[PDB]
mmCIF file of C-alpha atoms in Angstrom:
data_model
loop_
_atom_site.group_PDB
_atom_site.id
_atom_site.type_symbol
_atom_site.label_atom_id
_atom_site.label_comp_id
_atom_site.label_asym_id
_atom_site.label_seq_id
_atom_site.Cartn_x
_atom_site.Cartn_y
_atom_site.Cartn_z
ATOM 1 C CA UNK A 61 241.297 242.060 6.078
ATOM 2 C CA UNK A 62 241.678 240.077 9.358
ATOM 3 C CA UNK A 63 238.768 237.778 10.423
ATOM 4 C CA UNK A 64 238.530 239.169 14.025
ATOM 5 C CA UNK A 65 234.974 238.269 15.230
ATOM 6 C CA UNK A 66 232.657 240.848 16.880
ATOM 7 C CA UNK A 67 229.933 238.472 18.247
ATOM 8 C CA UNK A 68 226.799 240.753 17.958
ATOM 9 C CA UNK A 69 227.225 244.390 16.767
ATOM 10 C CA UNK A 70 223.515 244.966 15.847
ATOM 11 C CA UNK A 71 223.827 245.223 11.982
ATOM 12 C CA UNK A 72 226.979 243.262 10.905
ATOM 13 C CA UNK A 73 226.643 244.579 7.388
ATOM 14 C CA UNK A 74 229.100 243.344 4.656
ATOM 15 C CA UNK A 75 232.091 245.499 5.834
ATOM 16 C CA UNK A 76 230.941 244.551 9.428
ATOM 17 C CA UNK A 77 230.083 240.906 8.456
ATOM 18 C CA UNK A 78 233.526 239.596 9.756
ATOM 19 C CA UNK A 79 231.521 237.895 12.558
ATOM 20 C CA UNK A 80 229.310 235.781 10.235
ATOM 21 C CA UNK A 81 232.292 235.551 7.832
ATOM 22 C CA UNK A 82 234.535 233.970 10.503
ATOM 23 C CA UNK A 83 231.749 231.656 11.672
ATOM 24 C CA UNK A 84 231.102 230.311 8.109
ATOM 25 C CA UNK A 85 234.866 230.109 7.318
ATOM 26 C CA UNK A 86 235.655 227.834 10.366
ATOM 27 C CA UNK A 87 234.753 224.127 10.938
ATOM 28 C CA UNK A 88 231.047 224.724 11.962
ATOM 29 C CA UNK A 89 228.477 227.589 11.700
ATOM 30 C CA UNK A 90 228.162 229.519 14.998
ATOM 31 C CA UNK A 91 226.118 232.816 14.867
ATOM 32 C CA UNK A 92 222.891 230.815 15.503
ATOM 33 C CA UNK A 93 224.365 229.262 18.704
ATOM 34 C CA UNK A 94 224.415 232.880 19.954
ATOM 35 C CA UNK A 95 220.935 233.675 18.441
ATOM 36 C CA UNK A 96 219.119 230.808 20.275
ATOM 37 C CA UNK A 97 221.053 231.344 23.529
ATOM 38 C CA UNK A 98 220.268 235.109 23.252
ATOM 39 C CA UNK A 99 216.527 234.909 22.411
ATOM 40 C CA UNK A 100 215.963 232.489 25.317
ATOM 41 C CA UNK A 101 218.063 234.689 27.714
ATOM 42 C CA UNK A 102 215.514 237.492 26.949
ATOM 43 C CA UNK A 103 212.396 235.223 26.855
ATOM 44 C CA UNK A 104 213.011 233.086 30.001
ATOM 45 C CA UNK A 105 216.409 234.385 31.295
ATOM 46 C CA UNK A 106 214.610 237.818 31.616
ATOM 47 C CA UNK A 107 217.435 240.133 30.444
ATOM 48 C CA UNK A 108 216.138 243.765 30.193
ATOM 49 C CA UNK A 109 217.458 246.840 28.229
ATOM 50 C CA UNK A 110 216.430 249.440 25.558
ATOM 51 C CA UNK A 111 216.561 248.608 21.744
ATOM 52 C CA UNK A 112 220.139 247.206 22.132
ATOM 53 C CA UNK A 113 219.006 243.572 22.738
ATOM 54 C CA UNK A 114 215.961 243.940 20.402
ATOM 55 C CA UNK A 115 218.359 244.947 17.635
ATOM 56 C CA UNK A 116 220.740 241.979 18.330
ATOM 57 C CA UNK A 117 217.859 239.390 18.195
ATOM 58 C CA UNK A 118 216.222 241.001 15.086
ATOM 59 C CA UNK A 119 219.580 241.585 13.255
ATOM 60 C CA UNK A 120 220.418 237.856 13.703
ATOM 61 C CA UNK A 121 217.559 236.944 11.274
ATOM 62 C CA UNK A 122 218.138 240.155 9.228
ATOM 63 C CA UNK A 123 221.439 238.444 8.109
ATOM 64 C CA UNK A 124 220.781 234.698 8.654
ATOM 65 C CA UNK A 125 217.369 234.430 6.823
ATOM 66 C CA UNK A 126 218.334 236.893 4.059
ATOM 67 C CA UNK A 127 222.127 237.457 3.473
ATOM 68 C CA UNK A 128 223.803 234.184 4.598
ATOM 69 C CA UNK B 115 208.912 203.374 12.579
ATOM 70 C CA UNK B 116 209.355 206.281 10.090
ATOM 71 C CA UNK B 117 211.352 209.559 9.716
ATOM 72 C CA UNK B 118 208.245 211.449 8.335
ATOM 73 C CA UNK B 119 208.627 215.053 9.645
ATOM 74 C CA UNK B 120 206.272 216.972 11.980
ATOM 75 C CA UNK B 121 207.820 220.477 11.509
ATOM 76 C CA UNK B 122 206.889 222.278 14.823
ATOM 77 C CA UNK B 123 204.894 220.242 17.382
ATOM 78 C CA UNK B 124 206.070 222.449 20.331
ATOM 79 C CA UNK B 125 207.737 219.477 22.188
ATOM 80 C CA UNK B 126 209.567 217.211 19.683
ATOM 81 C CA UNK B 127 211.037 215.142 22.577
ATOM 82 C CA UNK B 128 213.169 211.950 21.856
ATOM 83 C CA UNK B 129 210.125 209.792 20.691
ATOM 84 C CA UNK B 130 208.619 212.808 18.763
ATOM 85 C CA UNK B 131 212.163 213.836 17.576
ATOM 86 C CA UNK B 132 211.620 212.423 13.981
ATOM 87 C CA UNK B 133 211.518 216.111 12.944
ATOM 88 C CA UNK B 134 215.056 216.984 14.178
ATOM 89 C CA UNK B 135 216.114 213.417 13.277
ATOM 90 C CA UNK B 136 215.100 213.814 9.611
ATOM 91 C CA UNK B 137 216.618 217.291 9.418
ATOM 92 C CA UNK B 138 220.041 216.013 10.680
ATOM 93 C CA UNK B 139 219.776 212.827 8.516
ATOM 94 C CA UNK B 140 219.391 214.845 5.216
ATOM 95 C CA UNK B 141 221.897 217.121 3.333
ATOM 96 C CA UNK B 142 222.038 219.823 6.102
ATOM 97 C CA UNK B 143 220.261 220.782 9.380
ATOM 98 C CA UNK B 144 216.883 222.564 8.954
ATOM 99 C CA UNK B 145 215.073 222.971 12.349
ATOM 100 C CA UNK B 146 217.381 226.015 12.790
ATOM 101 C CA UNK B 147 215.969 227.705 9.613
ATOM 102 C CA UNK B 148 212.563 227.496 11.326
ATOM 103 C CA UNK B 149 214.123 228.841 14.616
ATOM 104 C CA UNK B 150 215.316 232.164 13.051
ATOM 105 C CA UNK B 151 212.109 232.465 10.965
ATOM 106 C CA UNK B 152 210.012 231.736 14.123
ATOM 107 C CA UNK B 153 211.810 234.102 16.541
ATOM 108 C CA UNK B 154 211.456 236.943 14.031
ATOM 109 C CA UNK B 155 207.731 236.035 13.546
ATOM 110 C CA UNK B 156 207.389 236.881 17.308
ATOM 111 C CA UNK B 157 209.892 239.830 17.359
ATOM 112 C CA UNK B 158 208.666 241.689 14.217
ATOM 113 C CA UNK B 159 205.871 239.414 12.827
ATOM 114 C CA UNK B 160 204.055 240.090 16.189
ATOM 115 C CA UNK B 161 202.554 236.576 16.586
ATOM 116 C CA UNK B 162 200.326 236.246 19.709
ATOM 117 C CA UNK B 163 198.591 233.031 21.005
ATOM 118 C CA UNK B 164 197.923 231.132 24.309
ATOM 119 C CA UNK B 165 201.446 229.675 24.797
ATOM 120 C CA UNK B 166 201.540 227.903 21.372
ATOM 121 C CA UNK B 167 204.038 230.339 19.726
ATOM 122 C CA UNK B 168 205.876 230.754 23.086
ATOM 123 C CA UNK B 169 206.281 226.982 23.282
ATOM 124 C CA UNK B 170 207.571 226.741 19.638
ATOM 125 C CA UNK B 171 210.227 229.444 20.355
ATOM 126 C CA UNK B 172 211.284 228.050 23.774
ATOM 127 C CA UNK B 173 211.254 224.368 22.548
ATOM 128 C CA UNK B 174 213.655 225.246 19.679
ATOM 129 C CA UNK B 175 216.398 226.180 22.230
ATOM 130 C CA UNK B 176 215.233 223.417 24.647
ATOM 131 C CA UNK B 177 216.531 220.898 21.995
ATOM 132 C CA UNK B 178 219.011 222.975 19.880
ATOM 133 C CA UNK B 179 221.155 224.433 22.770
ATOM 134 C CA UNK B 180 221.029 221.187 24.793
ATOM 135 C CA UNK B 181 220.225 217.951 22.839
ATOM 136 C CA UNK B 182 220.866 218.357 19.047
#
């Protein structure tokens, strides 16, 4: 199965992990670079949407703190 | 001088950096583990205080994305 990254899907769950998978398989870990950029783009960058962005920021930890 | 850690001060600027400093000096980086734990403590833990928790979340990126 090809390691084609999907940046932030909103679950990224085992069969959809290829994101976190590619990022751990390469030279340095990378999903958190997105996570911190993303949380601050909502907090102080003032991005605004329905549960889409909520789900990206909360799924980041839902894999990073637990699965990874 | 000493490396003795301060976990989350809410600034951790170059002179107060001994936190981020100790965390990069040991086996692997660790301030980032706090970042994902912290952001989810706001997002789903529903922390609320008079800029203290705001400052912890926004300071994490203010050194992670930029400095370290």
